[PDB]
Amino acid sequence: LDITPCSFGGVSVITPGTNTSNQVAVLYQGVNCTEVPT
Amino acid sequence: SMTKTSVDCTMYICGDSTECSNLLLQYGSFCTQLKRALTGIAVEQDKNT
Amino acid sequence: PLSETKCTLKSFTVEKGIYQTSNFRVQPTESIVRFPNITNLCPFDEVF
């Protein structure tokens, strides 16, 4: 049986600052989100 | 411009063990310097275009 | 994730831009131990 390792890909956030808005856009880089931090 | 790369210290140094992540924090900000250095390359490669 | 910007950058406020934070952590579920079926114990009492 082959071994393919887990836990790959980064987490990037896109937000305006604290004097503007609290909304955060989150970029998942390189990982397909059709399959899918606390 | 050239190829923009990013190197994580979690998957490269450690073999996904609990002992390697606990002893990485004793060395501190050594991987804080390397992630800010590869970020500052990738800002200036977009300014070259 | 607004406070993940404040945790990694070690700053009280947030500056406008795009910041790299962290990576995925996938917790394992079970543990698999594989050993073949041998009904014979080793003769350690013969040499002792």
User: Tokens standing for A29?
Assistant: 């880089």
The amino acid sitting at B8 is D
Could you give the C-alpha distances from B1 to B7, B33, B44, in angstroms and in order?
19, 23, 9
Strand blocks (E) in chain A: 10-15, 25-29
Is C20's CB within 8 Å of B8's CB?
Answer: no
Is C23's CB within 8 Å of B39's CB?
Answer: no
For A11, the closest chain B residue by CA position comes to B8
| Reported resolution, Å | 3.4
Is A12's CB within 8 Å of C21's CB?
Answer: yes
**Around Cβ C17, how many Cβ atoms within 10 Å?**
12
Phi, psi of A28 (to 5 degrees): -95, 115
**Around Cβ A17, how many Cβ atoms within 10 Å?**
14
Could you give the C-alpha distances from A16 to A13, A21, B35, C19, C44, in angstroms and in order?
10, 6, 22, 11, 70
Q: Which DSSP letter does residue A19 get?
A: T
Specify the experimental method: cryo-EM
